[PDB]
Tab-separated table of C-alpha atoms in Angstrom:
chain	number	residue	atom	x	y	z
C	97	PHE	CA	-4.524	27.341	57.411
C	98	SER	CA	-6.763	30.405	56.676
C	99	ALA	CA	-6.867	33.380	54.334
C	100	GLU	CA	-5.393	35.718	57.098
C	101	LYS	CA	-2.190	33.243	57.195
C	102	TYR	CA	-2.063	33.735	53.708
C	103	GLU	CA	-1.743	37.370	54.046
C	104	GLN	CA	0.963	37.105	56.911
C	105	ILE	CA	3.064	35.110	54.428
C	106	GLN	CA	5.712	37.533	52.627
C	107	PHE	CA	7.896	37.072	49.927
C	108	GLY	CA	11.554	36.285	50.688
C	109	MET	CA	10.705	33.996	53.597
C	110	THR	CA	12.344	30.876	54.133
C	111	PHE	CA	10.600	27.442	53.739
C	112	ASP	CA	10.559	27.266	57.458
C	113	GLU	CA	8.997	30.363	58.090
C	114	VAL	CA	6.293	29.890	55.517
C	115	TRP	CA	5.465	26.466	56.762
C	116	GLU	CA	5.333	27.919	60.572
C	117	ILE	CA	2.703	30.688	59.444
C	118	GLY	CA	0.735	28.371	57.409
C	119	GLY	CA	-0.095	25.649	60.133
C	120	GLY	CA	2.874	23.386	59.901
C	121	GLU	CA	2.073	19.736	59.432
C	122	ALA	CA	-1.307	19.605	60.352
C	123	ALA	CA	-2.487	21.959	57.706
C	124	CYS	CA	0.353	21.929	54.940
C	125	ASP	CA	1.834	19.525	52.787
C	126	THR	CA	5.069	19.139	50.791
C	127	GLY	CA	7.208	16.602	48.688
C	128	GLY	CA	5.274	14.200	46.613
C	129	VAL	CA	3.725	15.874	43.430
C	130	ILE	CA	4.204	19.182	45.437
C	131	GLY	CA	7.922	18.712	45.391
C	132	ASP	CA	10.073	21.629	47.154
C	133	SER	CA	7.120	23.727	47.402
C	134	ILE	CA	4.158	24.045	49.977
C	135	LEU	CA	0.515	23.570	49.513
C	136	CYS	CA	-1.947	24.353	52.679
C	137	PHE	CA	-5.560	23.507	52.927
C	138	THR	CA	-8.146	25.243	55.003
C	139	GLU	CA	-10.365	22.068	55.817
C	140	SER	CA	-10.772	18.723	54.251
C	141	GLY	CA	-13.263	18.027	51.556
C	142	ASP	CA	-13.251	17.951	47.873
C	143	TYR	CA	-12.116	21.599	46.591
C	144	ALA	CA	-11.036	22.770	49.763
C	145	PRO	CA	-9.588	26.150	49.618
C	146	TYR	CA	-5.794	26.078	49.518
C	147	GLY	CA	-2.585	28.540	49.345
C	148	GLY	CA	0.661	27.175	47.398
C	149	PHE	CA	4.027	28.720	47.909
C	150	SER	CA	7.182	28.170	45.991
C	151	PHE	CA	10.862	29.001	46.982
C	152	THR	CA	13.902	29.976	44.923
C	153	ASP	CA	17.058	27.542	44.569
C	154	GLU	CA	18.358	30.040	47.495
C	155	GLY	CA	15.327	29.096	49.803
C	156	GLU	CA	13.170	32.364	49.260
C	157	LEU	CA	9.508	32.845	48.775
C	158	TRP	CA	8.806	33.907	45.029
C	159	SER	CA	5.187	32.681	44.500
C	160	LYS	CA	2.114	32.925	46.470
C	161	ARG	CA	-1.252	31.465	44.774
C	162	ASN	CA	-4.667	30.286	45.800
C	163	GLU	CA	-7.987	29.388	45.124
C	164	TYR	CA	-11.075	29.687	47.150
C	165	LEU	CA	-9.568	31.457	49.965
C	166	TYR	CA	-11.649	34.722	48.891
C	167	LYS	CA	-15.041	35.296	47.383
C	168	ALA	CA	-16.015	37.884	45.190
C	169	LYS	CA	-18.015	40.503	47.454
C	170	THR	CA	-20.349	41.038	44.151
C	171	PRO	CA	-20.314	38.239	41.409
C	172	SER	CA	-21.320	40.464	38.606
C	173	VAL	CA	-19.050	40.127	35.618
C	174	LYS	CA	-20.636	40.114	32.174
C	175	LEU	CA	-19.303	39.038	29.068
C	176	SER	CA	-19.778	43.045	27.982
C	177	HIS	CA	-17.170	43.998	30.516
C	178	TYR	CA	-14.736	40.879	29.249
C	179	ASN	CA	-15.132	42.255	25.415
C	180	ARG	CA	-13.897	45.710	26.720
C	181	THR	CA	-10.597	44.255	28.217
C	182	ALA	CA	-7.490	43.817	25.893
C	183	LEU	CA	-3.971	42.968	26.496
C	184	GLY	CA	-1.931	45.904	27.242
C	185	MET	CA	-4.285	47.670	29.140
C	186	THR	CA	-3.405	49.066	32.529
C	187	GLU	CA	-4.561	47.513	35.772
C	188	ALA	CA	-6.488	50.797	36.426
C	189	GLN	CA	-8.082	50.382	32.995
C	190	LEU	CA	-9.060	46.998	33.657
C	191	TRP	CA	-10.902	47.900	36.730
C	192	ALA	CA	-12.686	50.723	34.926
C	193	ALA	CA	-14.025	48.011	32.491
C	194	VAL	CA	-14.782	44.907	35.150
C	195	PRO	CA	-16.270	45.454	38.457
C	196	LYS	CA	-13.673	44.902	41.101
C	197	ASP	CA	-16.167	43.666	43.539
C	198	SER	CA	-16.865	40.793	41.021
C	199	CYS	CA	-13.071	39.509	41.343
C	200	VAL	CA	-10.579	38.139	43.782
C	201	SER	CA	-6.802	37.584	43.722
C	202	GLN	CA	-5.641	33.866	43.115
C	203	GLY	CA	-1.907	34.910	43.356
C	204	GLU	CA	1.176	37.056	43.235
C	205	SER	CA	4.643	36.206	42.153
C	206	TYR	CA	7.917	37.434	41.342
C	207	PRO	CA	9.743	35.004	38.755
C	208	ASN	CA	12.900	36.987	38.703
C	209	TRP	CA	13.170	37.460	42.611
C	210	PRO	CA	15.142	38.953	44.159
C	211	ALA	CA	14.642	41.414	41.507
C	212	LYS	CA	11.299	42.624	41.194
C	213	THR	CA	10.513	43.187	37.783
C	214	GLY	CA	8.001	41.030	35.985
C	215	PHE	CA	5.805	40.845	39.075
C	216	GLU	CA	2.457	38.891	38.203
C	217	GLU	CA	-0.924	39.097	39.554
C	218	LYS	CA	-3.674	36.725	38.820
C	219	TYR	CA	-7.364	37.788	39.041
C	220	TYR	CA	-10.626	35.363	39.113
C	221	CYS	CA	-14.134	37.082	38.463
C	222	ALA	CA	-16.986	34.597	39.469
C	223	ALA	CA	-20.161	35.940	37.327
C	224	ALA	CA	-22.349	34.207	39.964
C	225	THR	CA	-22.083	32.455	43.310
C	226	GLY	CA	-21.837	28.834	43.619
C	227	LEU	CA	-18.782	26.123	42.938
C	228	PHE	CA	-17.800	26.638	39.024
C	229	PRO	CA	-19.673	29.303	37.835
C	230	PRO	CA	-19.422	31.246	34.897
C	231	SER	CA	-16.106	33.508	35.050
C	232	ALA	CA	-13.381	35.558	33.729
C	233	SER	CA	-9.756	35.339	34.728
C	234	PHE	CA	-7.145	38.196	34.118
C	235	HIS	CA	-3.314	38.114	34.658
C	236	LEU	CA	-1.186	41.165	34.763
C	237	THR	CA	2.700	41.605	34.687
C	238	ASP	CA	3.802	44.738	36.395
C	239	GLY	CA	0.429	46.394	36.402
C	240	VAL	CA	-0.413	45.531	32.523
C	241	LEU	CA	-2.793	42.958	31.303
C	242	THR	CA	-0.957	40.072	29.931
C	243	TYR	CA	-3.379	37.215	30.059
C	244	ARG	CA	-7.378	37.190	29.600
C	245	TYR	CA	-9.645	34.364	29.588
C	246	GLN	CA	-13.354	33.683	30.271
C	247	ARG	CA	-15.784	30.554	30.781
C	248	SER	CA	-19.376	30.877	29.692
C	249	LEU	CA	-20.089	34.320	30.419
C	250	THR	CA	-23.311	35.916	29.422
K	279	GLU	CA	-28.491	2.558	62.970
K	280	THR	CA	-27.825	3.156	59.383
K	281	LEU	CA	-30.860	2.910	57.376
K	282	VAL	CA	-32.630	4.876	59.901
K	283	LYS	CA	-29.981	7.385	60.026
K	284	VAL	CA	-29.753	7.517	56.017
K	285	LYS	CA	-33.736	7.796	56.330
K	286	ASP	CA	-32.627	10.745	58.939
K	287	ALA	CA	-30.039	12.542	56.607
K	288	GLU	CA	-32.705	12.423	53.799
K	289	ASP	CA	-35.184	14.744	55.646
K	290	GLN	CA	-32.322	16.781	57.515
K	291	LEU	CA	-30.986	17.875	53.998
K	292	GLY	CA	-34.261	17.940	52.398
K	293	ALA	CA	-32.383	16.066	49.518
K	294	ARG	CA	-32.347	12.426	47.807
K	295	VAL	CA	-29.495	10.328	49.273
K	296	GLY	CA	-28.444	7.015	48.114
K	297	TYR	CA	-26.202	4.656	50.229
K	298	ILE	CA	-25.221	1.115	49.549
K	299	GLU	CA	-22.657	-1.219	51.627
K	300	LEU	CA	-21.145	-4.061	49.776
K	301	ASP	CA	-19.042	-7.277	50.902
K	302	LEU	CA	-15.440	-6.564	49.322
K	303	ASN	CA	-14.806	-10.303	48.924
K	304	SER	CA	-18.251	-12.061	48.245
K	305	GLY	CA	-19.903	-9.027	46.332
K	306	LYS	CA	-22.992	-9.619	48.727
K	307	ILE	CA	-25.037	-6.217	49.446
K	308	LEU	CA	-25.468	-5.593	53.157
K	309	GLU	CA	-27.842	-2.930	53.092
K	310	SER	CA	-29.131	-0.259	50.784
K	311	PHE	CA	-31.339	2.736	50.142
K	312	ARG	CA	-32.227	4.080	46.763
K	313	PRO	CA	-29.021	1.884	45.427
K	314	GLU	CA	-30.795	2.398	41.897
K	315	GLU	CA	-31.367	6.117	41.639
K	316	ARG	CA	-28.686	8.346	39.557
K	317	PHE	CA	-26.465	10.737	41.312
K	318	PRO	CA	-23.711	12.987	40.009
K	319	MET	CA	-20.454	11.529	40.481
K	320	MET	CA	-18.367	14.465	40.953
K	321	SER	CA	-14.884	13.975	41.962
K	322	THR	CA	-15.800	10.154	42.773
K	323	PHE	CA	-15.384	9.379	38.744
K	324	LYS	CA	-11.186	10.146	39.193
K	325	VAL	CA	-11.058	6.632	40.717
K	326	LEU	CA	-12.858	5.027	37.648
K	327	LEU	CA	-10.769	7.246	35.281
K	328	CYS	CA	-7.447	6.202	36.899
K	329	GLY	CA	-8.620	2.581	36.814
K	330	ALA	CA	-9.153	2.974	33.001
K	331	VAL	CA	-5.531	4.165	32.944
K	332	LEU	CA	-3.985	1.550	34.759
K	333	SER	CA	-5.898	-1.134	32.089
K	334	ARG	CA	-4.069	0.671	29.361
K	335	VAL	CA	-1.050	0.479	31.494
K	336	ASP	CA	-1.469	-3.185	31.865
K	337	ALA	CA	-2.256	-3.612	28.322
K	338	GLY	CA	1.099	-2.130	27.273
K	339	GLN	CA	-0.947	0.814	25.772
K	340	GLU	CA	0.086	3.511	28.529
K	341	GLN	CA	3.385	4.125	30.386
K	342	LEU	CA	3.063	5.355	34.211
K	343	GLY	CA	6.466	7.156	33.431
K	344	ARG	CA	5.151	9.131	30.317
K	345	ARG	CA	5.629	12.634	31.039
K	346	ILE	CA	2.967	15.005	29.803
K	347	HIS	CA	3.707	18.586	29.112
K	348	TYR	CA	0.800	21.019	29.131
K	349	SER	CA	0.140	24.815	29.318
K	350	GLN	CA	-1.880	27.648	30.549
K	351	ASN	CA	-4.783	26.674	28.775
K	352	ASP	CA	-5.196	23.346	29.990
K	353	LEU	CA	-5.858	24.745	33.736
K	354	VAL	CA	-9.170	24.501	34.715
K	355	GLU	CA	-10.970	25.603	37.935
K	356	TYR	CA	-9.021	23.916	41.031
K	357	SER	CA	-5.627	22.853	39.893
K	358	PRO	CA	-3.766	22.973	43.258
K	359	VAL	CA	-0.916	20.582	41.915
K	360	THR	CA	-1.037	21.079	38.030
K	361	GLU	CA	-0.666	24.876	38.302
K	362	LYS	CA	2.850	24.374	39.643
K	363	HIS	CA	4.198	21.988	37.020
K	364	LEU	CA	3.548	24.166	33.901
K	365	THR	CA	7.138	23.995	33.189
K	366	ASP	CA	8.478	20.645	34.122
K	367	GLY	CA	5.103	18.485	33.204
K	368	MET	CA	3.868	15.497	35.045
K	369	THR	CA	4.028	11.936	34.680
K	370	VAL	CA	0.967	9.751	33.980
K	371	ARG	CA	1.450	8.432	37.616
K	372	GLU	CA	1.745	11.782	39.294
K	373	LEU	CA	-1.432	12.579	37.331
K	374	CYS	CA	-3.521	9.880	38.769
K	375	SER	CA	-1.841	10.747	42.320
K	376	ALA	CA	-2.803	14.439	41.975
K	377	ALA	CA	-6.513	13.497	40.795
K	378	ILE	CA	-7.139	11.145	43.564
K	379	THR	CA	-5.650	12.371	46.502
K	380	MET	CA	-6.081	16.396	45.859
K	381	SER	CA	-9.087	15.913	43.454
K	382	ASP	CA	-6.830	18.267	40.915
K	383	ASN	CA	-9.484	19.185	37.945
K	384	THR	CA	-6.857	20.018	35.342
K	385	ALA	CA	-5.150	16.175	36.128
K	386	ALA	CA	-8.342	14.823	35.946
K	387	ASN	CA	-8.829	16.216	32.438
K	388	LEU	CA	-5.241	15.683	30.954
K	389	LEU	CA	-5.731	11.833	32.116
K	390	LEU	CA	-8.920	11.985	30.256
K	391	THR	CA	-7.239	13.098	27.152
K	392	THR	CA	-4.861	10.418	27.185
K	393	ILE	CA	-7.649	7.384	26.989
K	394	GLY	CA	-9.559	9.690	24.526
K	395	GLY	CA	-12.115	11.506	26.359
K	396	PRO	CA	-15.372	10.968	28.693
K	397	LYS	CA	-16.769	8.611	25.945
K	398	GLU	CA	-13.890	6.270	26.461
K	399	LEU	CA	-14.244	6.197	30.049
K	400	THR	CA	-17.876	5.183	29.328
K	401	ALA	CA	-16.735	2.441	26.817
K	402	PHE	CA	-14.062	1.254	29.305
K	403	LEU	CA	-16.831	0.973	32.080
K	404	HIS	CA	-19.552	-0.630	29.632
K	405	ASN	CA	-16.874	-3.277	28.457
K	406	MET	CA	-16.473	-4.389	32.177
K	407	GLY	CA	-20.405	-4.766	32.641
K	408	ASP	CA	-21.367	-1.537	34.253
K	409	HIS	CA	-24.029	-0.255	31.827
K	410	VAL	CA	-25.065	2.251	34.184
K	411	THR	CA	-22.241	4.748	34.950
K	412	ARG	CA	-21.548	7.396	32.314
K	413	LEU	CA	-19.181	10.130	32.136
K	414	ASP	CA	-20.230	13.034	29.537
K	415	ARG	CA	-18.100	15.984	30.129
K	416	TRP	CA	-14.883	17.247	31.277
K	417	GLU	CA	-14.030	19.257	34.419
K	418	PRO	CA	-15.277	21.567	35.804
K	419	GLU	CA	-18.814	21.205	33.868
K	420	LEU	CA	-19.309	17.725	35.005
K	421	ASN	CA	-20.180	18.648	38.349
K	422	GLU	CA	-23.222	20.637	37.430
K	423	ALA	CA	-25.942	18.339	38.759
K	424	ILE	CA	-29.063	19.572	36.913
K	425	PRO	CA	-31.910	17.815	38.652
K	426	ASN	CA	-32.699	14.684	36.494
K	427	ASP	CA	-29.752	15.354	34.267
K	428	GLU	CA	-28.285	11.673	33.724
K	429	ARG	CA	-25.241	12.756	32.501
K	430	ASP	CA	-22.138	12.212	34.379
K	431	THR	CA	-24.280	10.120	37.043
K	432	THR	CA	-23.750	6.677	38.418
K	433	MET	CA	-25.965	4.404	40.747
K	434	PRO	CA	-24.929	3.841	44.226
K	435	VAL	CA	-24.858	0.028	43.268
K	436	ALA	CA	-23.140	0.392	39.848
K	437	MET	CA	-20.360	2.605	41.457
K	438	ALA	CA	-20.009	0.047	44.355
K	439	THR	CA	-19.851	-3.074	42.041
K	440	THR	CA	-17.294	-1.577	39.955
K	441	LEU	CA	-15.237	-0.136	42.464
K	442	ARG	CA	-15.156	-3.851	44.031
K	443	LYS	CA	-14.098	-5.154	40.551
K	444	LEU	CA	-11.338	-2.564	39.886
K	445	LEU	CA	-10.106	-3.236	43.448
K	446	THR	CA	-10.174	-6.960	43.695
K	447	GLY	CA	-11.153	-8.534	40.350
K	448	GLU	CA	-8.615	-9.721	37.955
K	449	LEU	CA	-9.732	-6.516	36.119
K	450	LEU	CA	-6.414	-5.215	36.653
K	451	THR	CA	-3.035	-6.721	37.619
K	452	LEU	CA	-2.031	-7.037	41.115
K	453	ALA	CA	0.492	-4.252	40.769
K	454	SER	CA	-2.264	-2.013	39.366
K	455	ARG	CA	-5.067	-3.011	41.889
K	456	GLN	CA	-2.547	-2.030	44.423
K	457	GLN	CA	-1.514	1.213	43.216
K	458	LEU	CA	-5.320	2.294	42.686
K	459	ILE	CA	-6.272	1.757	45.973
K	460	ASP	CA	-2.714	3.383	47.496
K	461	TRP	CA	-3.836	6.482	45.674
K	462	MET	CA	-7.154	6.327	47.456
K	463	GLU	CA	-5.456	5.490	50.770
K	464	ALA	CA	-3.428	8.496	50.527
K	465	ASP	CA	-6.527	10.541	49.903
K	466	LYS	CA	-6.001	13.923	51.438
K	467	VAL	CA	-9.006	15.762	51.067
K	468	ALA	CA	-11.617	13.646	52.789
K	469	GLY	CA	-10.942	13.613	56.687
K	470	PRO	CA	-14.481	15.096	57.608
K	471	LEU	CA	-16.506	12.268	56.297
K	472	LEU	CA	-15.879	8.160	56.898
K	473	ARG	CA	-12.268	9.166	58.094
K	474	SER	CA	-13.859	11.317	60.498
K	475	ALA	CA	-15.661	8.247	62.316
K	476	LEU	CA	-13.317	5.505	61.845
K	477	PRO	CA	-11.093	4.154	64.788
K	478	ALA	CA	-7.776	3.314	64.986
K	479	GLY	CA	-6.346	0.140	63.287
K	480	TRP	CA	-9.217	0.709	60.634
K	481	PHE	CA	-8.097	0.702	57.161
K	482	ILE	CA	-9.546	3.428	54.811
K	483	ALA	CA	-9.152	3.945	51.037
K	484	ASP	CA	-11.619	6.652	49.750
K	485	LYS	CA	-12.504	9.208	47.200
K	486	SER	CA	-15.098	12.183	48.135
K	487	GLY	CA	-16.725	14.608	45.734
K	488	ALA	CA	-18.868	17.759	45.998
K	489	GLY	CA	-20.651	19.466	42.827
K	490	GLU	CA	-23.162	22.097	42.586
K	491	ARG	CA	-26.747	22.453	43.863
K	492	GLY	CA	-25.547	20.713	47.267
K	493	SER	CA	-24.255	17.646	45.822
K	494	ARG	CA	-21.975	15.582	48.017
K	495	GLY	CA	-20.837	11.791	47.971
K	496	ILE	CA	-18.071	9.426	48.800
K	497	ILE	CA	-16.905	5.866	47.736
K	498	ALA	CA	-14.763	3.752	50.057
K	499	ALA	CA	-12.918	0.451	50.899
K	500	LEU	CA	-12.774	0.193	54.548
K	501	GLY	CA	-12.499	-2.344	57.590
K	502	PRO	CA	-11.111	-3.209	60.820
K	503	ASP	CA	-7.504	-4.451	61.529
K	504	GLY	CA	-5.859	-2.589	58.737
K	505	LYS	CA	-7.554	-4.769	55.919
K	506	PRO	CA	-10.709	-3.305	53.706
K	507	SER	CA	-13.488	-5.668	53.978
K	508	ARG	CA	-16.404	-3.577	52.727
K	509	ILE	CA	-17.387	-1.032	50.041
K	510	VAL	CA	-19.339	1.834	50.894
K	511	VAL	CA	-20.937	4.420	48.696
K	512	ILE	CA	-23.082	7.478	49.401
K	513	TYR	CA	-24.411	10.225	47.189
K	514	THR	CA	-26.639	13.281	48.128
K	515	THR	CA	-28.025	16.026	45.777
K	516	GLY	CA	-30.635	18.605	45.485
K	517	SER	CA	-30.177	19.724	49.114
K	518	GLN	CA	-29.833	23.387	50.499
K	519	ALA	CA	-28.163	22.854	53.621
K	520	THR	CA	-24.647	24.045	54.494
K	521	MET	CA	-21.589	22.697	53.301
K	522	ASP	CA	-20.975	21.485	56.947
K	523	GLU	CA	-24.481	20.031	57.760
K	524	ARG	CA	-24.386	17.524	54.762
K	525	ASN	CA	-20.872	16.932	55.793
K	526	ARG	CA	-22.575	16.214	59.058
K	527	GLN	CA	-24.878	14.037	57.787
K	528	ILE	CA	-22.246	11.570	55.953
K	529	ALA	CA	-19.895	11.161	58.872
K	530	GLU	CA	-23.174	10.329	60.745
K	531	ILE	CA	-23.999	7.661	58.370
K	532	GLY	CA	-20.382	6.317	58.518
K	533	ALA	CA	-20.460	6.616	62.551
K	534	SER	CA	-23.410	4.475	62.373
K	535	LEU	CA	-22.499	1.890	60.091
K	536	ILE	CA	-19.004	1.768	61.686
K	537	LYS	CA	-20.946	1.176	65.184
K	538	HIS	CA	-23.330	-1.607	63.591
K	539	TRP	CA	-20.360	-3.249	61.467
C-alpha cells in the first residue's frame, strides 16, 4: 500500500474498488476491530504508515484517513503560530497563521455522503523531525476551522 | 551464530544492543548479551499492560466485554483502530487486540486508564516479582528514550522472565494466558523482524516496538512444530542507522538463533 494508492482512492468508490486499489489481501485488513471498513499498511513494523477507509450503508466510500503517509516538508510550527489560530477562521486564514509546509493531511471525509455539506479535513503539523515530535492539529469543516489542538509546542 | 551476530549488530548500528533467549518451560537462560542493561520498552510494554488487564479480569475486577466510550480528546499519535470507534466505543477485549496487534496508542492509554495508570502497571509488575520493569508515562511520551533515562524501561532478562510468567505461570488463568498469547500471535505489524526468518511449521507470538533516537525491539515466544518453546527479547537504542537497517540487524539475530536453535 502507499500514498500514491491513497490518492487513487475516491469518494463514492465501493468496498471492492478501494480494496483493489489499496493492495488487496497483501496490504489491507478488514473485519475484527476494523469492522466493515478497510485499513491498509505500507510496510510491517511498529507505527507503520497506514490509510483507513469507511463506507456508507449503501457501500460508498465517505471517509479517508491516514497517519504518516506524508511528512511535512519543513517541520516548523511554533506555539506562536498556534496562538494565532481560532475556531471560525477560514482555511486561508489558517494558512496565513501557520506555515503550510510544516503540515500534512491526515484525512478527508463527507459525514453526510452523498451530500457534500460538512466536509471535514484533518491536518497534522510537526514542529520537528522524528516519531512523536511536538505538534499541532487542525480540523476544518467546509473550509472553516472547527478543532484545534497542540501538544508540547515551543 | 547468534552472540557473534548480536555483537556484529552492535557496531553496525553504533548503539547498545541487548539480547536474551530463555527456555519457555524451564526458565533456563540459553544465552544473553547485556541482559541487565536497561532499554526503552516502546510498544512491547502493551503485552504487559494487557496481562495486568487479564489479571483483573481473572479477579472479577474487570470484564473483557465492558464497553468503553471515549472521545476526540483521548486520541493520540497513531490510532489506526480507535479513530474509527469514537461513536460506538470499544470493549476491553477489542482494546487489547488493537493495542497488541496494531500498536494503537490510544487503545493503550484507554487500557492504562482501566487499571489506574502507569504506576498501577509498575505495581502489578512489582507484585509478581519484577522489580526492574517500570512504566512512567502515557503514549506517546513513553517512547522518548532520553539517554540514561530509566523511565519506561526494562531489562532484557526482566522482560523475558516476566513474559514467561504471564504466558505459562499460574499468574493468569488458562483462558487468560491463552487470550494473551492469541493476541500476540495475530500480531500484524512485526513481519520484518523475527517472523521474517521463521520457517513453516514454526509458531510465533510476538510484539515489536520502535521509539525515538533509533530505539527498536521485540519480544517473542516461538518454536518448531507450531508450539512455542522459547522466549526471545531484543532491544537496541541510541542508533543513527536507517529504520530498515536496524530492522535488518534484528532479522539477522533471529535468522541466526533460528539456524542455531
